[PDB]
């Protein structure tokens, strides 16, 4: 046998047994009869589809929005580039004697610290930030925690 | 030849022999249901077959406008109206005998005078 | 509403507070299966209706062999008031009606 | 209307008149092999052999047609339920991603969306597919029994003339598909490359 | 030929709904052994059901086409011998007046 | 049927070897003794909500099984006449009550004649022999292989 089958329980109940099958058909002797026939006839005489609409405006005016037009697009849909541009900021060099102290506190919080997160937390240029980061920490590329900066064993083993 | 079907699962039965009574039994191959055969015939392969000579005869055959008419006498109701057609078997060995269908009694007779 | 399968651990006792067995109590109830025309079905299958009002009356001859249902005057004189119930199968066999409800999920 | 692709279904009567066993096998798209008709019927939800013949032959006394159907049921006897019939179809399918359990679902989808598409492609229409399949088998047996001549390919009633309308419709359908594909490719490029 | 014309095709669904309302039994409840005289109804090569009195259906269908309710291009064939009723609505069929 | 009967949705995989409701009770009784990154860009094809909802609900078809496993029926959804039916229930006063229909399910019996398995089914049809024996099922039944759930449950229950 198989241990697991993944059933889906539901509350069910038999609430009757069918005894007769019926086909309701309007009586041909009813005074209102032949109105259904007209309704049935109208079913085949109805065309839901609508014909294409042809523009009656001047061709030159219609094409004014096509091609190398002078109009500046006002659409904001899927403007990925615009969104990123607005959010921009840069700090200035935030001298050494303070940053070198801050990293160790950041390292103490967690022993494996990413580059992207570190730039987010420290807000430094990557250029200057690399100098201090390499002086204090090292990166293990070939290990399971690849591309992750970690404090050097000399300072971690304290 | 008549095909038989099982009662418990609707599967078709197959012949079997019972040496205890030397009889013919039709037994199902899945649910072990048996039933004595009413006839000893189990197979037939008619190399020359006449099945399909009048295939397609319906209650409203006379309503077909493409069928030809004839004035031959119906030897079951004595009527002159009828629609006739050739054999419906497409094997290129059948005779050109005509089959007549009466429009008053739905009786089918043939013009054959050799064997009938 | 996913749930365990064989449930050899007996988890249904607390997960659900209702019996999980099919209720074969109301099965002994005569039911007629009726196929309706498009015009009549379009107004009898609406869920914004069926307030328990009178939809008509079923008329059966004393000797049988002929049935007919007559609607009330609520149709607005737009459809026939008399219909013939054609029994496509006098003896209907092995057809049943079963419901479906959600189970209480706590305790 | 809807996809404009064409799928061909062939029901083939193997063996000659001098053979002791002539079976019928049908070719299904994306299956790579010819399957006996009985197995296909079971895959559609018709397990009983009697029900299988009922869809094929519409006459009880037409024993001659039933006799020719005897080998077909004999070949497809080792399969006697829907689940195993679907798995047999699935194993022959050329996907090789389905491992052992998606095979049943994969086979079910093929029989639903790619098998006889001109009837329907929505779930819950296995009965219609089976009845048409029996109709195809019934027609094949009728010709095989010298009761109906093979269909004439020169019959003008079975031919269609494609005018500028249908010809342009297919061209526009193909070109529009390319345009739609190009549009999305721009969206993917625009989203990933951070472009307006 | 001079009088030859080629159809443009129309929607077959209106014809299918008409057949259902006039006694075209759905194929889901078709038992061949309980009715070995029914006529198979085909619309654009699709078997949609069976119908017990093919004469009345054909007369009603022909009358509707002639007066104009059904598009004249729709082709209707009743094979009495084969017990089949075929209705064609697709485009590309060649027809001529008579 | 052997009461009680359960009608729920379950996956139709290895139904032949599935445990019978009575057996789980027997096994449950045994328990008492023991105690004491992505591509970041993908295309989704628009699909009508009705079909997707129908597909999700109908993934696991209805299965009706009795206590002893003597009856096992699997329901298949039907769409031809699902929404064109109306039910009239006869109350115990002579009157009739109308209830619209929702769906139609066709139930087919499962595991009544010791169905084989796919692995063995392919082997037999393959060129293992000229043709499968006419009474192969009878021969294998005596060997004991290829049993049924009802036969599977009775022996285990009797063994206790
Ligand atoms: Zn049997
Ligand atoms: Zn006569």
From Swiss-Prot, chain A:
Superkingdom: Eukaryota
Signal peptide start-end: none
Compartments, as annotated in UniProt: Nucleus
Job description of the protein: TFIIF is a general transcription initiation factor that binds to RNA polymerase II. Its functions include the recruitment of RNA polymerase II to the promoter bound DNA-TBP-TFIIB complex, decreasing the affinity of RNA polymerase II for non-specific DNA, allowing for the subsequent recruitment of TFIIE and TFIIH, and facilitating RNA polymerase II elongation.
Family: Belongs to the TFIIF beta subunit family.
Further comment: Present with 520 molecules/cell in log phase SD medium.
Subunit structure: TFIIF is composed of three different subunits: TFG1/RAP74, TFG2/RAP30 and TAF14.
Protein name, UniProt field: Transcription initiation factor IIF subunit beta
Lineage: Eukaryota, Fungi, Dikarya, Ascomycota, Saccharomycotina
Section of the entire sequence shown: 201 to 358 of 400
Curated annotation (Swiss-Prot), chain B:
Positions where Phosphoserine occurs in the chain: 39
Zinc finger (C4-type) in chain: 6-31
Residues binding Zn(2+) 2: 74, 77, 102, 105
Zinc finger (TFIIS-type): 70-110
Gene3D superfamilies reported in the protein's UniProt record: 2.20.25.10
Disulfide bonds: none
A Gene Ontology molecular function term of the record: zinc ion binding
Family annotation (InterPro entries): DNA-dir_RNA_pol-M_15_CS (IPR019761), Rpa12/Rpb9/Rpc10/TFS (IPR012164), Zn_ribbon_RPB9 (IPR001529), Zn_ribbon_RPB9_C (IPR034012), Znf_TFIIS (IPR001222)
GO cellular component: nucleolus; nucleus; RNA polymerase II, core complex
First-listed, main subcellular location of the protein, grouped into a coarse class: nucleus
Keywords: DNA damage, DNA repair, DNA-directed RNA polymerase, Metal-binding, Nucleus, Phosphoprotein, Transcription, Zinc, Zinc-finger
Quaternary structure annotation from Swiss-Prot or TrEMBL: Component of the RNA polymerase II (Pol II) complex consisting of 12 subunits.
Function field: DNA-dependent RNA polymerase catalyzes the transcription of DNA into RNA using the four ribonucleoside triphosphates as substrates. Component of RNA polymerase II which synthesizes mRNA precursors and many functional non-coding RNAs. Pol II is the central component of the basal RNA polymerase II transcription machinery. It is composed of mobile elements that move relative to each other. RPB9 is part of the upper jaw surrounding the central large cleft and thought to grab the incoming DNA template. Involved in the regulation of transcription elongation.
Protein name: DNA-directed RNA polymerase II subunit RPB9
Swiss-Prot record, chain E:
Subcellular location: Nucleus
Top-level lineage group: Eukaryota
Purpose of the protein: DNA-dependent RNA polymerase catalyzes the transcription of DNA into RNA using the four ribonucleoside triphosphates as substrates. Second largest component of RNA polymerases II which synthesizes mRNA precursors and many functional non-coding RNAs. Proposed to contribute to the polymerase catalytic activity and forms the polymerase active center together with the largest subunit. Pol II is the central component of the basal RNA polymerase II transcription machinery.
Similarity section: Belongs to the RNA polymerase beta chain family.
Subunit structure: Component of the RNA polymerase II (Pol II) complex consisting of 12 subunits.
Note in the entry: The binding of ribonucleoside triphosphate to the RNA polymerase II transcribing complex probably involves a two-step mechanism. The initial binding seems to occur at the entry (E) site and involves a magnesium ion coordinated by three conserved aspartate residues of the two largest RNA Pol II subunits.
Protein name: DNA-directed RNA polymerase II subunit RPB2
The species this protein was found in: Saccharomyces cerevisiae (strain ATCC 204508 / S288c)
Gene: RPB2
Swiss-Prot record, chain F:
Signal sequence segment: none
Post-translational modification: Phosphorylated on Ser and other residues by TAF1 and casein kinase II-like kinases.
UniProt-annotated location(s): Nucleus
Further details from the record: Present with 1920 molecules/cell in log phase SD medium.
Assembly and binders: TFIIF is composed of three different subunits: TFG1/RAP74, TFG2/RAP30 and TAF14.
Family the entry assigns: Belongs to the TFIIF alpha subunit family.
Stated name of the protein: Transcription initiation factor IIF subunit alpha
Gene source species: Saccharomyces cerevisiae (strain ATCC 204508 / S288c)
